[PDB]
Design an enzyme around this catalytic site. Structure first.
Site, PDB file in Angstrom:
ATOM      1  N   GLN A  11       0.753  -1.214   0.107  1.00 38.38           N
ATOM      2  CA  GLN A  11       0.132  -0.010   0.264  1.00 38.38           C
ATOM      3  C   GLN A  11       0.958   1.225   0.011  1.00 38.38           C
ATOM      4  O   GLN A  11       0.426   2.151  -0.730  1.00 38.38           O
ATOM      5  CB  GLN A  11      -1.023   0.065   1.039  1.00 38.38           C
ATOM      6  CG  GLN A  11      -1.541  -1.136   1.463  1.00 38.38           C
ATOM      7  CD  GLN A  11      -2.337  -1.276   2.832  1.00 38.38           C
ATOM      8  OE1 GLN A  11      -1.623  -1.721   3.774  1.00 38.38           O
ATOM      9  NE2 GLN A  11      -3.565  -0.909   3.073  1.00 38.38           N
ATOM     10  N   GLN A  15       0.771   3.767  -3.085  1.00 36.55           N
ATOM     11  CA  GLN A  15       0.297   5.365  -2.977  1.00 36.55           C
ATOM     12  C   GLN A  15       1.532   6.432  -3.076  1.00 36.55           C
ATOM     13  O   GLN A  15       1.369   7.465  -3.479  1.00 36.55           O
ATOM     14  CB  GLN A  15      -0.325   5.348  -1.556  1.00 36.55           C
ATOM     15  CG  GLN A  15       0.563   5.033  -0.387  1.00 36.55           C
ATOM     16  CD  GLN A  15       1.306   6.432   0.266  1.00 36.55           C
ATOM     17  OE1 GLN A  15       0.656   7.506   0.092  1.00 36.55           O
ATOM     18  NE2 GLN A  15       2.539   6.309   0.567  1.00 36.55           N
ATOM     19  N   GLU A  64      -3.390  -6.969  -2.249  1.00 39.16           N
ATOM     20  CA  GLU A  64      -4.815  -6.761  -2.117  1.00 39.16           C
ATOM     21  C   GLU A  64      -5.042  -5.530  -3.070  1.00 39.16           C
ATOM     22  O   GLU A  64      -4.266  -4.900  -3.379  1.00 39.16           O
ATOM     23  CB  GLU A  64      -4.924  -6.437  -0.474  1.00 39.16           C
ATOM     24  CG  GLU A  64      -4.389  -5.034  -0.189  1.00 39.16           C
ATOM     25  CD  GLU A  64      -5.087  -3.852  -0.378  1.00 39.16           C
ATOM     26  OE1 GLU A  64      -6.275  -3.896  -0.400  1.00 39.16           O
ATOM     27  OE2 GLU A  64      -4.688  -2.711  -0.263  1.00 39.16           O
ATOM     28  N   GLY A 136       5.259  -3.225   6.455  1.00 39.65           N
ATOM     29  CA  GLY A 136       4.085  -3.811   5.815  1.00 39.65           C
ATOM     30  C   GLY A 136       4.462  -5.354   5.395  1.00 39.65           C
ATOM     31  O   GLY A 136       5.428  -5.667   5.249  1.00 39.65           O
ATOM     32  N   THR A 172       2.246   1.707  13.647  1.00 39.57           N
ATOM     33  CA  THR A 172       0.900   1.219  13.261  1.00 39.57           C
ATOM     34  C   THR A 172       0.651  -0.222  13.551  1.00 39.57           C
ATOM     35  O   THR A 172      -0.472  -0.643  13.511  1.00 39.57           O
ATOM     36  CB  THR A 172       0.707   1.692  11.855  1.00 39.57           C
ATOM     37  OG1 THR A 172       1.453   0.640  11.167  1.00 39.57           O
ATOM     38  CG2 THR A 172       1.258   3.133  11.596  1.00 39.57           C
ATOM     39  N   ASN A 221       3.966  12.149   1.083  1.00 34.96           N
ATOM     40  CA  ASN A 221       4.329  11.701  -0.041  1.00 34.96           C
ATOM     41  C   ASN A 221       4.829  12.900  -0.991  1.00 34.96           C
ATOM     42  O   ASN A 221       5.573  12.545  -1.850  1.00 34.96           O
ATOM     43  CB  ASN A 221       3.075  10.947  -0.488  1.00 34.96           C
ATOM     44  CG  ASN A 221       2.325  10.272   0.293  1.00 34.96           C
ATOM     45  OD1 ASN A 221       3.033   9.474   1.246  1.00 34.96           O
ATOM     46  ND2 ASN A 221       1.281   9.658  -0.036  1.00 34.96           N
ATOM     47  N   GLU A 247      27.479   7.326 -11.021  1.00 37.46           N
ATOM     48  CA  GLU A 247      28.324   8.237 -10.322  1.00 37.46           C
ATOM     49  C   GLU A 247      27.820   8.651  -9.242  1.00 37.46           C
ATOM     50  O   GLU A 247      28.379   8.645  -7.912  1.00 37.46           O
ATOM     51  CB  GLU A 247      28.436   9.558 -11.412  1.00 37.46           C
ATOM     52  CG  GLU A 247      29.201  10.495 -10.595  1.00 37.46           C
ATOM     53  CD  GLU A 247      29.071  12.063 -11.470  1.00 37.46           C
ATOM     54  OE1 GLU A 247      28.483  12.051 -12.452  1.00 37.46           O
ATOM     55  OE2 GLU A 247      29.883  12.866 -11.064  1.00 37.46           O
TER      56      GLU A 247
HETATM   57  N1  LIG Z   1       5.576   7.577   5.251  1.00 35.59           N
HETATM   58  C1  LIG Z   1       4.623   6.866   5.002  1.00 35.59           C
HETATM   59  N2  LIG Z   1       4.411   5.360   5.552  1.00 35.59           N
HETATM   60  C2  LIG Z   1       3.609   4.619   4.981  1.00 35.59           C
HETATM   61  C3  LIG Z   1       2.423   5.296   3.966  1.00 35.59           C
HETATM   62  N3  LIG Z   1       1.590   4.243   4.168  1.00 35.59           N
HETATM   63  C4  LIG Z   1       2.020   3.055   4.624  1.00 35.59           C
HETATM   64  N4  LIG Z   1       3.280   3.242   5.264  1.00 35.59           N
HETATM   65  C5  LIG Z   1       3.927   2.584   6.118  1.00 35.59           C
HETATM   66  O1  LIG Z   1       3.632   1.328   6.159  1.00 35.59           O
HETATM   67  C6  LIG Z   1       3.808   0.449   7.367  1.00 35.59           C
HETATM   68  C7  LIG Z   1       2.746  -0.671   7.584  1.00 35.59           C
HETATM   69  O2  LIG Z   1       2.692  -1.386   6.184  1.00 35.59           O
HETATM   70  P1  LIG Z   1       1.040  -1.442   5.436  1.00 35.59           P
HETATM   71  O3  LIG Z   1       0.186  -0.322   5.895  1.00 35.59           O
HETATM   72  O4  LIG Z   1       0.489  -2.749   6.122  1.00 35.59           O
HETATM   73  O5  LIG Z   1       1.308  -1.648   3.934  1.00 35.59           O
HETATM   74  P2  LIG Z   1       1.776  -2.687   2.869  1.00 35.59           P
HETATM   75  O6  LIG Z   1       3.213  -2.447   2.951  1.00 35.59           O
HETATM   76  O7  LIG Z   1       0.990  -2.926   2.112  1.00 35.59           O
HETATM   77  O8  LIG Z   1       1.764  -4.001   3.918  1.00 35.59           O
HETATM   78  P3  LIG Z   1       0.302  -5.068   4.054  1.00 35.59           P
HETATM   79  O9  LIG Z   1      -0.798  -4.269   3.984  1.00 35.59           O
HETATM   80  O10 LIG Z   1       0.605  -6.213   4.801  1.00 35.59           O
HETATM   81  O11 LIG Z   1       0.575  -5.871   2.404  1.00 35.59           O
HETATM   82  C8  LIG Z   1       3.194   1.495   8.339  1.00 35.59           C
HETATM   83  O12 LIG Z   1       4.278   1.458   9.589  1.00 35.59           O
HETATM   84  C9  LIG Z   1       3.625   2.874   7.686  1.00 35.59           C
HETATM   85  O13 LIG Z   1       5.038   3.273   8.126  1.00 35.59           O
HETATM   86  C10 LIG Z   1       2.625   6.578   3.706  1.00 35.59           C
HETATM   87  O14 LIG Z   1       1.698   6.837   3.033  1.00 35.59           O
HETATM   88  N5  LIG Z   1       3.477   7.424   4.045  1.00 35.59           N
HETATM   89 MG   LIG Z   2      -0.929  -3.952   2.269  1.00 34.67          MG
END
Ligand SMILES: Nc1nc2c(ncn2[C@@H]2O[C@H](COP(=O)(O)OP(=O)(O)OP(=O)(O)O)[C@@H](O)[C@H]2O)c(=O)[nH]1
Ligand SMILES: [Mg+2]
Ligand SMILES: CC(=O)O[C@H]1C(=O)[C@@]2(C)[C@H]([C@H](OC(=O)c3ccccc3)[C@]3(O)C[C@H](OC(=O)[C@H](O)[C@@H](NC(=O)c4ccccc4)c4ccccc4)C(C)=C1C3(C)C)[C@]1(OC(C)=O)CO[C@@H]1C[C@@H]2O
Ligand SMILES: CC(=O)O[C@H]1C(=O)[C@@]2(C)[C@H]([C@H](OC(=O)c3ccccc3)[C@]3(O)C[C@H](OC(=O)[C@H](O)[C@@H](NC(=O)c4ccccc4)c4ccccc4)C(C)=C1C3(C)C)[C@]1(OC(C)=O)CO[C@@H]1C[C@@H]2O
Ligand SMILES: Nc1nc2c(ncn2[C@@H]2O[C@H](COP(=O)(O)OP(=O)(O)OP(=O)(O)O)[C@@H](O)[C@H]2O)c(=O)[nH]1
Ligand SMILES: Nc1nc2c(ncn2[C@@H]2O[C@H](COP(=O)(O)OP(=O)(O)O)[C@@H](O)[C@H]2O)c(=O)[nH]1
Ligand SMILES: Nc1nc2c(ncn2[C@@H]2O[C@H](COP(=O)(O)OP(=O)(O)O)[C@@H](O)[C@H]2O)c(=O)[nH]1
Ligand SMILES: [Mg+2]
Lengths: 430, 426, 430, 426
Positions: A11, A15, A64, A136, A172, A221, A247
């Site tokens: 995710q 994003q 997903e 994640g 989170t 972002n 470089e």
């Molecule tokens: N800086 C930043 N971190 C994000 C953002 N979205 C998600 N994260 C990071 O993603 C971490 C958790 O991973 P997920 O939200 O589950 O996203 P994922 O990598 O797809 O993992 P899964 O949902 O299990 O597939 C959080 O601790 C956030 O730090 C974002 O928009 N900006």
């Molecule tokens: Mg995810």
């Protein structure tokens, strides 16, 4: 020429891609529909067809569908190649186990298929820009499976790593260190230069500098996109000192395993604040080394600098760069390792930073991209290792990782590897 | 796409599930006749999660209504949304269980388990990608506790990999309406711990405490308790029916929320909650939602969390909000109240945020908690069982159904084992 | 070149700043918005950006927000850099104790941070112009904490001290001598030349000379601003005899601890009164030594002059200055110490005084700034020492100072230090 | 930003606090329904000091209404501004204290202290930067004197650093309405001296003297005495709610006004005060405000300052005035009447000026005084206590509540100790 394939996993990856391409279409002047109203400055990131359409060379992979089929509904639904944005059926459950063995196994073969069909039009492919999050499930497991096969199919090509790293306090999920530790083998073995992103530090950045009390991740972002575009600035536009992507990473890397530099961006400043400052090259140079501007919650004053890279862009004169770096080497509070009395790599680009119309960042004639490796960043791992102990000491959540096909000892190899990395970043500081 | 198949057991289960169906039909904008009437397309993409697409663009929920009496079926079909349900999933006997667990698990419900299985299997094969089964039932009496555990065991046997989450209203000492509840609860949790991946414990007394001491209702009826249950019913599955910044489906919760396989009886809660004359004055900001959320008054069981330690807590927020304050409250709660959360596991909170708030609400928060204090209901059920076990009352109405003493002994031993594990980590 | 960083501490400091910058923007012709409608005469006090904006190099520090966020609402809300005007959360409670140890501790680090970011653009920084009040809690405690760190970070730079000193009769608080006595260590050790301001003497000035029956403190401010601008007149405009800020303080100071001169301004006169007088150089020279024109309620005729500095501005010829000072040395009623038969330092500037449109001061072609050290000023401390005894003899209010982290004996060191200063200003008079 | 949390105890306390709420709601331009209706933005910046921001731009005061009877709650909620208050801060019992200090401090109020603490704590955590607690109560009877001291002690225990200012209407011999007042006053001041950082002593007799001999009211009711109290109630906190040239919040007063920690029972007063037919003729200039201000008739206690020496006096002026005349009157008063002010401490006056005068007033002056003559009420209370102490009346109604003789003895000893310290510096 000079093409780069961007990978977006999880995710967070998809994003942050949505924000990055939002920045790229504006800075290169492409409509959300892919057209050019009216130089080959877009060949680095976008492909061209006969009808005058700009097609990005990017893959959105999420186990997903919700975020990606949300992208299929957003303003950029027609910008992207629809089946180069790949969706799974079962979410990763914040679990490295299924993402690395179970659910990503059936989808990775299509991902590499699309990577190949993105590589075969790149005549001068420079490197890879993969985006994910450590904590994640997808960003850990699927990236771990993917860099493994990319390192054997594109071993020569550079693989830059832009990853989102957990905060010392803000979190989170409870399983985040579990996902983070099994990622460490990938960055050490199957990455060339990793860029770590902390949410709480940049929360402090937007709280103090942007004066905005209530930003979202979209504000995060719309500055990660600036940092990545500034890193890619020399490859797409003209500059007096253009730094090649090879470089760049040759200037960052002292040893094959020491390739984990911090990142900061200047000037991060609100529109109401841009007016009252002249915003010289010197102060944006001085603001970057300030620990209150670091992207990762670690104090550089606690550590020693090895490699310094001055990625300026906009109306910046290199003489002012030399004058600024003379002052930088003048103060003792910034002590570099005895490796680099030369200290600084300088890169200047002629394109001023491009502002997002809905963003919270001010329009400034000058912008600098700061990328530096230092030994102080081991503290960002020095709390994660003690953290991982604090769960693994009972085998806290391993039955899921065991239940999804992971060997129990893979945690043992994981903390052995992070300990090796932590040691490696300490001996070089002497 | 992550279809979820619902089963109703007992009068408690089927009426609260029916009111849940009403609530989420309003959320998805579904007409009482089954036609779509929602405003935005956001209500429409994940209709497949709860409803089946049919001719005429009308939608039938994927619910299997199970009971041992036709009277409850008569009431639910004549209820506000009785017509939207499948005539085939009204699977029911004629003679009731008489609040006898043995009747439901051996004689009365064993004959109807064949007629429920052929329906649940067809519902599952009608799904594109099944995720799990959400089952509503009552630990009190012999219908919901009796046949519910049997068919739960059957579906777990034939669906070993799907998520199994159950919402269980469970007996209580001071608001007990039936004499023989503790037998039923002890014989039900025996199967709930071994089979269910997820169990939400709901106690009626704390629902009453919510409706008086927080909602200020003078006459909150049984339907209001059903409403309080259905709020969290809809909240726990919000992420896989609507987009949000942090998507957390059922298995996302599971991987974060149950440290050891058997520690899966959890603490539901929902915010905001106000009286009619006090919502006009309240500031609904997320920090205030949090201060309401971890209050011992907001919970739906008598187990006061101050008598234990939280293992894991899940806060699935909902609405158009940013999230730095979300992290700051979720760390402040576990920092200033670190004595109420297991310090040995540092970040006890799972955070999820949805982009579309509930209809009429600008924002909402759903509480799911793993506290060692939940053993308060379990050990009290075991003690009340012992007060009617140690020297043989009421056993002729079970042993007459083929039930046996040693299985009661093992059920009590398993209650003791559970309370032992939950006191171990306190 | 020739920059000076102005510090404003406490309510008195911030409001006297509001009046001073009101005078400076008018005399240098800057709008309240910071723009220049149409020489580098402003570089001494104001910084310039690319857009043509004048940004003052000043810090407003108050431990309470009311006055400063009132400035955030006034006509000068946009003139100042908003986060160089620092506000606290808890007021100083007229207490040196919390202001020096408790509440100013958390805010001083940001204050020095802003001082550094004001110093780094000053290429020719000349000195510091800090404003406060002795009796106030902030103006005592926070200034005491601040000069300590400024004296070790900017030890070479001169630190002029413009402070507001209690009256023999007029007082606003009972704890004022307590705050005043613990300030004496700061002026003796961490100040280069202190200028003391008495409210009752200047009350008499405005009663007699300005003919105004009902002025406010704003009238006091619109003459303290003139005295400070006249002291800084030579650094900003051209003059036949321009006196450097270092030259000035070298001419004032006979010994490192004797640096406490009186100040007077001439001609303090109302608009109705300016018409009937020719207002020669001689009479403004004679009016300054008149005890009815002193800024501090002490009789110079009771004491002996050590150093005399004639800071003229406007249409003044130095020959007339010599002719006036010949008459000044002619009379015996003005007896100088046997140190200085040369007597007088002369400074002439070509800029006539700038009149505030809402002020009560007349427009005069000539203005003179009188700064002189004398032994008679010890009487202004000779009632404050007997005053402090009159409270300390029971330990009158010390439980608050004790309760906020002050050592009880710090009062003992305080009156020992004031006694040492009082002695030091008596032996030199022989 | 310097939030101040209000608590009402007893019928006297809650009604005078309610009229104070009415007064400062008019000053801040707050509608009876709670919405803002003020004219200038100056009424708006420091709303957070007394009121909580809520949805709809309506503002709820930070007041906790505490009583042992529901009748006073019924009257206040049905009063002119009853609807603006929080329904939750109406925390109250059913059986009254019967003017029994022991009842309120041990039995009747001890059960309700838990229900008041959970409200005051939530109010305090709702604040951004708490400054203190302003508590209104009565030394007469057993409700205000009884539970008020208990909860004051509790909040002092858990908030040790915040400012504690209390406004206390206290018994009197000639306008006494209850037989058992002196017991209550002696048992209340015992805790007031040890815990409170600030106490304003208010005597009803001098309020009557003000309303007859200065205000010329033929029938000044109890609400007029409440008004006279609320005038200084609003005056003492003017500086931290509005800008002024000399800002002096509560702790600004404290650091200047109480030379030794226990000498903190003070003398309130307010100017101007005229009859209806004499305001037309009066020159409201500041010097005349001063000559009215230090008059023995303007004060709100029977303690005539000519029978003692002022330790410290606080004159918080208000309105668009210059201040040289302020200093000249504040020095002339203590110079020409230097025999009434302790010569050993020279400048007995603290001067504060606010820029916005009260609505309908061009200027106003609020009097706060530390005089050794305030011991007149304390020693008289001790003497009346002795007339009902030395040989045992009424003690069965205290000792029946668990109260004991030796604590009465220590309370009397502490009254004697206080009057000793206040006569020491006279
Ligand atoms: N800086 C930043 N971190 C994000 C953002 N979205 C998600 N994260 C990071 O993603 C971490 C958790 O991973 P997920 O939200 O589950 O996203 P994922 O990598 O797809 O993992 P899964 O949902 O299990 O597939 C959080 O601790 C956030 O730090 C974002 O928009 N900006
Ligand atoms: Mg995810
Ligand atoms: C005018 C106004 O603002 O009133 C609101 C309201 O916010 C209040 C009064 C509502 C109101 O709820 C109740 O009165 C109630 C009574 C018994 C048990 C539970 C609720 C409301 O009825 C409930 C309703 O909430 C919803 O519509 C949510 O989507 C909710 N669905 C239902 O409550 C519902 C009602 C009838 C039929 C179907 C659904 C929901 C919550 C969680 C997950 C999914 C859906 C709203 C906003 C209100 C009213 C109308 C007064 C409250 O309800 C909820 C669930 O948010 C009770 O406390 C909350 C918050 C408020 O105090
Ligand atoms: C036409 C006219 O000039 O009449 C004035 C007035 O000045 C007089 C008559 C007012 C008037 O007050 C009384 O009649 C009164 C009666 C009993 C007890 C106290 C007052 C007035 O009612 C009071 C009112 O004062 C205020 O509004 C202040 O802001 C005051 N607030 C209130 O009195 C108030 C009244 C009703 C509801 C809410 C508040 C205040 C004072 C201190 C701190 C905060 C607020 C004013 C100017 C008048 C009238 C209307 C006649 C006086 O009141 C005050 C508090 O200043 C009584 O003596 C003073 C001065 C005057 O004699
Ligand atoms: N001449 C002059 N003196 C002032 C002025 N404002 C304040 N003062 C002096 O300041 C003294 C009291 O200090 P405060 O008013 O408390 O101001 P402060 O320095 O911020 O101290 P704190 O309020 O405790 O933080 C008075 O005795 C005045 O002499 C002014 O405008 N002109
Ligand atoms: N929370 C809640 N509890 C209920 C409701 N209806 C009944 N109960 C209680 O829950 C218990 C469940 O027992 P019951 O369902 O009747 O047993 P069964 O007939 O064998 O399924 C009963 O003893 C009731 O007192 C309801 O609508 N909500
Ligand atoms: N100044 C003033 N005094 C009052 C008021 N109402 C009552 N009193 C007196 O104050 C005393 C306080 O006692 P009371 O509050 O009744 O005792 P409690 O019931 O235990 O709190 C009573 O004896 C009354 O005579 C009022 O509105 N103003
Ligand atoms: Mg101040």
């Amino acid at each position: 020429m000079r093409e780069c394939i961007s990978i977006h996993v999880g995710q967070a990856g998809v994003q942050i891609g949505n924000a990055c391409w939002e920045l790229y279409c504006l800075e290169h002047g492409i409509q959300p529909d892919g057209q050019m109203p009216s130089d080959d400055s877009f060949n680095t990131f976008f492909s061209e067809t006969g009808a005058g359409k700009h097609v990005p060379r990017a893959v959105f992979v999420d186990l997903e569908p919700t975020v990606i089929d949300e992208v299929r509904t957003g303003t950029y639904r027609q910008l992207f190649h629809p089946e180069q944005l790949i969706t799974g059926k079962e979410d990763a459950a914040n679990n490295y186990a299924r993402g690395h063995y179970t659910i990503g196994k059936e989808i990775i073969d299509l991902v590499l298929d699309r990577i190949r069909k993105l590589a075969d039009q790149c005549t001068g492919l420079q490197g890879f820009l993969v985006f994910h999050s450590f904590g994640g499930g997808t960003g850990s497991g699927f990236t771990s499976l993917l860099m493994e096969r990319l390192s054997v199919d594109y071993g020569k090509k550079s693989k830059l790593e832009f990853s989102i790293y957990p905060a010392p306090q803000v979190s989170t999920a409870v399983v985040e260190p579990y996902n983070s530790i099994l990622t460490t083998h990938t960055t050490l073995e199957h990455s060339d230069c990793a860029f770590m992103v902390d949410n709480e530090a940049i929360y402090d950045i937007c709280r103090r500098n942007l004066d905005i009390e209530r930003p979202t991740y979209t504000n995060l972002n719309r500055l990660i996109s600036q940092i990545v575009s500034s890193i890619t600035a020399s490859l797409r536009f003209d500059g007096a000192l253009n730094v090649d992507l090879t470089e760049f990473q040759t200037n960052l890397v002292p040893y094959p395993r020491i390739h984990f530099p911090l990142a900061t961006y200047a000037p991060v400043i609100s529109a109401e604040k841009a007016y009252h400052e002249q915003l010289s090259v010197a102060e944006i140079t001085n603001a970057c080394f300030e620990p209150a501007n670091q992207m990762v919650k670690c104090d550089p004053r606690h550590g020693k600098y090895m490699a310094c890279c001055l990625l300026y862009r906009g109306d910046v004169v290199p003489k002012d760069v030399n004058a600024a770096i003379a002052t930088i080497k003048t103060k003792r509070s910034i002590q570099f390792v005895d490796w680099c009395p030369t200290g600084f790599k300088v890169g200047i680009n002629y394109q001023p930073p491009t502002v997002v119309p809905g963003g919270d960042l001010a329009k400034v004639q000058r912008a600098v991209c700061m990328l530096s490796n230092t030994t102080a960043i081991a503290e960002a791992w020095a709390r994660l290792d003690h953290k991982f102990d604090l769960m693994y000491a009972k085998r806290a959540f391993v039955h899921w990782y065991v239940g999804e096909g992971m060997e129990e000892g893979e945690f043992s190899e994981a903390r052995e590897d992070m300990a090796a990395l932590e040691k490696d970043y300490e001996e070089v500081g002497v | 796409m992550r279809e979820i198949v619902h089963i109703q057991a007992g009068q408690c289960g089927n009426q609260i599930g029916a009111k849940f169906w009403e609530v989420i039909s309003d959320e998805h904008g579904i007409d009482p006749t089954g036609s779509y009437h929602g405003d935005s397309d956001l209500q429409l993409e994940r209709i497949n999660v709860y409803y089946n697409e049919a001719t005429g663009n009308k939608y039938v929920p994927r619910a299997i209504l199970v009971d041992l009496e036709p009277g409850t079926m008569d009431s639910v079909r004549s209820g506000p949304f009785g017509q939207i349900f499948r005539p085939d999933n009204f699977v029911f006997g004629q003679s009731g269980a008489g609040n006898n667990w043995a009747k439901g698990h051996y004689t009365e419900g064993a004959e109807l388990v064949d007629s429920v299985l052929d329906v649940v299997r067809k519902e599952s094969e009608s799904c594109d990608c099944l995720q799990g089964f959400q089952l509503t039932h009552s630990l009190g009496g012999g219908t919901g506790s009796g046949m519910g555990t049997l068919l739960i065991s059957k579906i777990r046997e034939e669906y070993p990999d799907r998520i199994m989450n159950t919402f269980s209203v469970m007996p209580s000492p001071k608001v007990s309406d039936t004499v023989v509840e503790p037998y039923n609860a002890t014989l039900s949790v025996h199967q709930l711990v071994e089979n269910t991946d997820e169990t939400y414990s709901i106690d009626n007394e704390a629902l009453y405490d919510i409706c008086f001491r927080t909602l200020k209702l003078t006459t909150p009826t049984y339907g209001d308790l059903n409403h309080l249950v259905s709020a969290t019913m809809s909240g726990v599955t919000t992420c896989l029916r609507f987009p949000g910044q942090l998507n957390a489906d059922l298995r996302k919760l599971a991987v974060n929320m149950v440290p050891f396989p058997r520690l899966h009886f959890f603490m539901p809660g929902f915010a905001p909650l106000t009286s009619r004359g006090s919502q006009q004055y309240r500031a609904l900001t997320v920090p205030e939602l949090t201060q309401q959320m971890f209050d011992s008054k907001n919970m739906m069981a008598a187990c006061d969390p101050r008598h234990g330690r939280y293992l894991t807590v899940a806060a699935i927020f909902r609405g158009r909000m940013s999230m730095k304050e979300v992290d700051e409250q979720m760390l402040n709660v576990q920092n200033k109240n670190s004595s109420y959360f297991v310090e040995w596991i540092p970040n006890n909170v799972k955070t999820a945020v949805c982009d579309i708030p509930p209809r009429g609400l600008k924002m909402s928060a759903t509480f799911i908690g793993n506290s060692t204090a939940i053993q308060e209901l379990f050990k009290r059920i075991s003690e009340q069982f012992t007060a009617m076990f140690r020297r043989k009352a009421f056993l002729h109405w079970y042993t007459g159904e083929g039930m046996d003493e040693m299985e009661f002994t093992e059920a009590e031993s398993n209650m003791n084992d559970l309370v032992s594990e939950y006191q171990q980590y306190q």
